[PDB]
Enzyme design. Structure first.
Site, PDB file in Angstrom:
ATOM      1  N   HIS A 199       0.805  -1.213   0.000  1.00 37.86           N
ATOM      2  CA  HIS A 199       0.000   0.000   0.000  1.00 37.86           C
ATOM      3  C   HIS A 199       0.844   1.272   0.000  1.00 37.86           C
ATOM      4  CE1 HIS A 199      -2.945  -2.925   1.826  1.00 37.86           C
ATOM      5  NE2 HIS A 199      -3.599  -2.442   0.782  1.00 37.86           N
ATOM      6  N   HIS A 223       6.044   7.083   6.047  1.00 34.64           N
ATOM      7  CA  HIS A 223       5.710   6.565   4.720  1.00 34.64           C
ATOM      8  C   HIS A 223       5.278   7.745   3.854  1.00 34.64           C
ATOM      9  CE1 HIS A 223       1.949   6.619   6.972  1.00 34.64           C
ATOM     10  NE2 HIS A 223       1.452   7.041   5.822  1.00 34.64           N
ATOM     11  N   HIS A 256       2.596   9.141   0.442  1.00 34.07           N
ATOM     12  CA  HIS A 256       1.537   8.957  -0.544  1.00 34.07           C
ATOM     13  C   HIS A 256       1.949   9.731  -1.798  1.00 34.07           C
ATOM     14  CE1 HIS A 256      -1.177   7.394   2.668  1.00 34.07           C
ATOM     15  NE2 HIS A 256      -0.406   8.171   3.410  1.00 34.07           N
ATOM     16  N   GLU A 288      -2.449  13.922   0.173  1.00 40.96           N
ATOM     17  CA  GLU A 288      -3.737  13.601   0.777  1.00 40.96           C
ATOM     18  C   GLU A 288      -4.432  14.889   1.216  1.00 40.96           C
ATOM     19  OE1 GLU A 288      -3.122  10.105   3.517  1.00 40.96           O
ATOM     20  OE2 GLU A 288      -4.054   9.259   1.691  1.00 40.96           O
ATOM     21  N   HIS A 336       4.261  11.270   5.797  1.00 39.30           N
ATOM     22  CA  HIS A 336       3.605  11.117   7.097  1.00 39.30           C
ATOM     23  C   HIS A 336       4.578  10.483   8.076  1.00 39.30           C
ATOM     24  CE1 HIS A 336      -0.612  11.168   5.112  1.00 39.30           C
ATOM     25  NE2 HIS A 336      -0.071  12.372   5.291  1.00 39.30           N
ATOM     26  N   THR A 376      -5.704   7.644   7.458  1.00 36.00           N
ATOM     27  CA  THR A 376      -6.265   7.820   6.120  1.00 36.00           C
ATOM     28  C   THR A 376      -6.276   6.491   5.358  1.00 36.00           C
ATOM     29  OG1 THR A 376      -4.183   8.374   5.016  1.00 36.00           O
ATOM     30  CG2 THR A 376      -5.404  10.164   6.036  1.00 36.00           C
ATOM     31  N   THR A 377      -5.863   5.399   5.989  1.00 35.26           N
ATOM     32  CA  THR A 377      -6.095   4.089   5.379  1.00 35.26           C
ATOM     33  C   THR A 377      -6.864   3.240   6.392  1.00 35.26           C
ATOM     34  OG1 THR A 377      -4.085   2.971   6.173  1.00 35.26           O
ATOM     35  CG2 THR A 377      -3.935   4.041   4.052  1.00 35.26           C
TER      36      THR A 377
HETATM   37  N1  LIG Z   1      -1.700   7.672   6.388  1.00 37.59           N
HETATM   38  S1  LIG Z   1      -1.704   7.649   7.974  1.00 37.59           S
HETATM   39  O1  LIG Z   1      -0.466   8.151   8.492  1.00 37.59           O
HETATM   40  O2  LIG Z   1      -2.852   8.342   8.458  1.00 37.59           O
HETATM   41  C1  LIG Z   1      -1.850   6.133   8.601  1.00 37.59           C
HETATM   42  N2  LIG Z   1      -2.986   5.481   8.292  1.00 37.59           N
HETATM   43  N3  LIG Z   1      -2.941   4.188   8.746  1.00 37.59           N
HETATM   44  C2  LIG Z   1      -1.838   3.842   9.430  1.00 37.59           C
HETATM   45  C3  LIG Z   1      -1.702   2.567   9.982  1.00 37.59           C
HETATM   46  C4  LIG Z   1      -2.693   1.610   9.823  1.00 37.59           C
HETATM   47  C5  LIG Z   1      -2.494   0.341  10.398  1.00 37.59           C
HETATM   48  C6  LIG Z   1      -1.333   0.060  11.096  1.00 37.59           C
HETATM   49  C7  LIG Z   1      -0.341   1.033  11.263  1.00 37.59           C
HETATM   50  C8  LIG Z   1      -0.583   2.267  10.701  1.00 37.59           C
HETATM   51 CL1  LIG Z   1       0.782   3.186  11.117  1.00 37.59          CL
HETATM   52  S2  LIG Z   1      -0.754   5.189   9.522  1.00 37.59           S
HETATM   53 ZN   LIG Z   2      -0.168   8.216   5.418  1.00 36.96          ZN
END
Ligand SMILES: NS(=O)(=O)c1nnc(-c2ccccc2Cl)s1
Ligand SMILES: [Zn+2]
Length: 257
Positions: free
Chosen positions: A61, A91, A93, A103, A116, A195-196
């Site tokens: 992802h 990471h 995007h 984003e 991020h 955001t995921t």
């Molecule tokens: N793009 S983000 O930083 O909001 C983010 N969204 N999901 C994240 C995440 C989901 C599952 C496990 C660990 C993480 Cl770090 S981190």
């Molecule tokens: Zn992110």
């Protein structure tokens, strides 16, 4: 499974993760004229001199650089935060083209990519407990625009080849994330979400106003990654970003006027 393609992309997420239509979802558009300057806000305190990176991973992802968070090595304090937040990973995007990829947007402007840096509140003891709290995470968001190269990023760029497909990882030690920061730490902040998936509403977002510059060549290398696993049909890793969501009953605050 969830993804970013036409059959499993962001407008489908709500069927497995109904919080997708929640009240404090991210990202959002930052309307710079309705953001409220808040003189009560403290400066950010970024303490990354003792950061210990461990590994870089293609999780299907995005790619994540992971840090040792068993101790207060690399932490974020100050700003709108109370408490100490430990860095666990960062990471990006990014887009298929330079005019999209971030984003968050600023007055509807999209940037080429968004970094991020994810931190969790040490009062909850571990990351898994933190994501269940309304103040459990703090994510530092930095925009990338295309122009000159960022020397501090090239070490990351140069390993991507070795983690091209989903599930691949490589040792990645002694990386200093201070190399990725803009000159100024002025920011916007609002309460939001991952955001995921699982899209948990546990994040204090801190979005830096000043973008960093990266070269076309550098961003080009991001776009050569693959969403698929080895031996699978090639799906380039591009446009792994979630649209702006409704602000609903939230105020964005600014640390600067
Ligand atoms: N793009 S983000 O930083 O909001 C983010 N969204 N999901 C994240 C995440 C989901 C599952 C496990 C660990 C993480 Cl770090 S981190
Ligand atoms: Zn992110």
């Amino acid at each position: 499974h969830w993804g970013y393609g036409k059959h499993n992309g962001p407008e489908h997420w709500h069927k497995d993760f109904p919080i997708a239509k929640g009240e404090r979802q991210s990202p959002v558009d930052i309307d710079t004229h309705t953001a409220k300057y808040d003189p009560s806000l403290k400066p950010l305190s970024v303490s990354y001199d003792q950061a210990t990176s461990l590994r870089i991973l293609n999780n299907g992802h995005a790619f994540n650089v992971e840090f040792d968070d068993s101790q207060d090595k690399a932490v974020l304090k100050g700003g709108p935060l109370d408490g100490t937040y430990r860095l666990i990973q960062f990471h990006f995007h990014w887009g298929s083209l330079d005019g999209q990829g971030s984003e968050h947007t600023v007055d509807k402007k999209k940037y080429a990519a968004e970094l991020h840096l994810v931190h969790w509140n040490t009062k909850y003891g571990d990351f898994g407990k933190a994501v269940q709290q309304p103040d459990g995470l703090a994510v530092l968001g930095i925009f990338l625009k295309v122009g000159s190269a960022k020397p501090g990023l090239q070490k990351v760029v140069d390993v991507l080849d070795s983690i091209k497909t989903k599930g691949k990882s490589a040792d990645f030690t002694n990386f200093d994330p201070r190399g990725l920061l803009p000159e100024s730490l002025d920011y916007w902040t609002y309460p939001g979400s991952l955001t995921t998936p699982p899209l948990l509403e546990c994040v204090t977002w801190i979005v830096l106003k000043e973008p960093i510059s990266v070269s076309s060549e550098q961003v080009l290398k991001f776009r050569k990654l693959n969403f698929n696993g080895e031996g699978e049909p090639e799906e380039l890793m591009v446009d792994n970003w979630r649209p702006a969501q409704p602000l609903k009953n939230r105020q964005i605050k600014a640390s600067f006027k």
